[PDB]
Design a protein around this motif. Structure first.
Motif, PDB file in Angstrom:
ATOM      1  N   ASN A  70       5.401  -3.387 -31.685  1.00 33.07           N
ATOM      2  CA  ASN A  70       5.700  -2.336 -30.704  1.00 33.07           C
ATOM      3  C   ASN A  70       4.676  -2.309 -29.574  1.00 33.07           C
ATOM      4  OD1 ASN A  70       6.149  -1.521 -33.678  1.00 33.07           O
ATOM      5  ND2 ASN A  70       7.779  -0.409 -32.621  1.00 33.07           N
ATOM      6  N   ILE A  71       3.497  -2.827 -29.860  1.00 34.45           N
ATOM      7  CA  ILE A  71       2.418  -2.891 -28.886  1.00 34.45           C
ATOM      8  C   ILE A  71       2.377  -4.273 -28.233  1.00 34.45           C
ATOM      9  CG2 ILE A  71      -0.067  -3.413 -28.993  1.00 34.45           C
ATOM     10  CD1 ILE A  71      -0.448  -0.644 -30.257  1.00 34.45           C
ATOM     11  N   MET A  72       2.476  -5.318 -29.059  1.00 30.16           N
ATOM     12  CA  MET A  72       2.471  -6.693 -28.581  1.00 30.16           C
ATOM     13  C   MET A  72       3.496  -6.875 -27.465  1.00 30.16           C
ATOM     14  SD  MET A  72       2.374 -10.380 -29.589  1.00 30.16           S
ATOM     15  CE  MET A  72       2.150 -11.165 -31.183  1.00 30.16           C
ATOM     16  N   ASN A  73       4.746  -6.488 -27.734  1.00 30.41           N
ATOM     17  CA  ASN A  73       5.813  -6.591 -26.737  1.00 30.41           C
ATOM     18  C   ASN A  73       5.423  -5.851 -25.458  1.00 30.41           C
ATOM     19  OD1 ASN A  73       8.618  -7.830 -27.796  1.00 30.41           O
ATOM     20  ND2 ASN A  73       7.547  -6.889 -29.519  1.00 30.41           N
ATOM     21  N   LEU A  74       4.918  -4.631 -25.624  1.00 27.62           N
ATOM     22  CA  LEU A  74       4.476  -3.818 -24.491  1.00 27.62           C
ATOM     23  C   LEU A  74       3.309  -4.499 -23.782  1.00 27.62           C
ATOM     24  CD1 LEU A  74       4.706  -0.154 -25.831  1.00 27.62           C
ATOM     25  CD2 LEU A  74       6.223  -1.344 -24.245  1.00 27.62           C
ATOM     26  N   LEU A  75       2.279  -4.858 -24.552  1.00 28.86           N
ATOM     27  CA  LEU A  75       1.112  -5.546 -24.004  1.00 28.86           C
ATOM     28  C   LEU A  75       1.549  -6.824 -23.291  1.00 28.86           C
ATOM     29  CD1 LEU A  75      -1.974  -7.005 -24.332  1.00 28.86           C
ATOM     30  CD2 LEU A  75      -0.827  -7.801 -26.401  1.00 28.86           C
ATOM     31  N   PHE A  76       2.395  -7.608 -23.963  1.00 30.59           N
ATOM     32  CA  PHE A  76       2.920  -8.852 -23.402  1.00 30.59           C
ATOM     33  C   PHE A  76       3.640  -8.584 -22.082  1.00 30.59           C
ATOM     34  CE2 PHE A  76       2.459 -12.447 -26.326  1.00 30.59           C
ATOM     35  CZ  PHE A  76       2.716 -13.498 -25.467  1.00 30.59           C
ATOM     36  N   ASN A  77       4.419  -7.497 -22.041  1.00 28.11           N
ATOM     37  CA  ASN A  77       5.148  -7.121 -20.836  1.00 28.11           C
ATOM     38  C   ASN A  77       4.185  -6.615 -19.768  1.00 28.11           C
ATOM     39  OD1 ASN A  77       7.982  -5.377 -19.729  1.00 28.11           O
ATOM     40  ND2 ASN A  77       8.065  -7.456 -20.556  1.00 28.11           N
ATOM     41  N   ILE A  78       3.270  -5.726 -20.163  1.00 28.55           N
ATOM     42  CA  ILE A  78       2.273  -5.195 -19.235  1.00 28.55           C
ATOM     43  C   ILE A  78       1.520  -6.348 -18.582  1.00 28.55           C
ATOM     44  CG2 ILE A  78       0.010  -4.066 -19.107  1.00 28.55           C
ATOM     45  CD1 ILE A  78       2.386  -2.180 -18.931  1.00 28.55           C
ATOM     46  N   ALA A  79       0.891  -7.190 -19.404  1.00 30.73           N
ATOM     47  CA  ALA A  79       0.172  -8.353 -18.893  1.00 30.73           C
ATOM     48  C   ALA A  79       1.098  -9.203 -18.018  1.00 30.73           C
ATOM     49  CB  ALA A  79      -0.392  -9.174 -20.045  1.00 30.73           C
ATOM     50  N   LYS A  80       2.368  -9.286 -18.423  1.00 31.28           N
ATOM     51  CA  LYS A  80       3.372 -10.045 -17.682  1.00 31.28           C
ATOM     52  C   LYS A  80       3.563  -9.475 -16.277  1.00 31.28           C
ATOM     53  CE  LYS A  80       5.553 -13.737 -17.774  1.00 31.28           C
ATOM     54  NZ  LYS A  80       5.175 -14.604 -16.618  1.00 31.28           N
ATOM     55  N   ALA A  81       3.914  -8.194 -16.199  1.00 30.09           N
ATOM     56  CA  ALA A  81       4.136  -7.538 -14.913  1.00 30.09           C
ATOM     57  C   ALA A  81       2.832  -7.330 -14.136  1.00 30.09           C
ATOM     58  CB  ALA A  81       4.849  -6.208 -15.119  1.00 30.09           C
TER      59      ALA A  81
ATOM     60  N   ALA B 274      -0.331  -8.966  -9.771  1.00 28.21           N
ATOM     61  CA  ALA B 274      -1.722  -9.255  -9.437  1.00 28.21           C
ATOM     62  C   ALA B 274      -1.812 -10.527  -8.606  1.00 28.21           C
ATOM     63  CB  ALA B 274      -2.556  -9.381 -10.706  1.00 28.21           C
ATOM     64  N   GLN B 275      -1.160 -11.582  -9.077  1.00 24.93           N
ATOM     65  CA  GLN B 275      -1.165 -12.857  -8.352  1.00 24.93           C
ATOM     66  C   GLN B 275      -0.142 -12.865  -7.206  1.00 24.93           C
ATOM     67  OE1 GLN B 275       1.296 -16.029 -11.059  1.00 24.93           O
ATOM     68  NE2 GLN B 275       0.877 -13.929 -11.706  1.00 24.93           N
ATOM     69  N   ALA B 276       0.602 -11.774  -7.060  1.00 18.62           N
ATOM     70  CA  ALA B 276       1.583 -11.655  -5.996  1.00 18.62           C
ATOM     71  C   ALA B 276       1.053 -10.745  -4.889  1.00 18.62           C
ATOM     72  CB  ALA B 276       2.904 -11.128  -6.545  1.00 18.62           C
TER      73      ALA B 276
END
Length: 38
Positions: free
Chosen positions: A10-21, A26-28
């Protein structure tokens, strides 16, 4: 987080998404300081 060992599905998916977006934007928006204007 349990002494930093709190990365459940439940956190990994969120963390993965957060880091993703966050990295995406950030690089955009923070790479060419004008890549998120369009």
């Amino acid at each position: 987080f349990t002494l930093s060992l709190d990365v459940p599905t439940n956190i990994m998916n969120l963390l993965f998404n957060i880091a993703k977006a966050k990295n995406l934007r950030a690089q955009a928006a923070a790479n060419a300081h004008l890549m998120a204007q369009i």
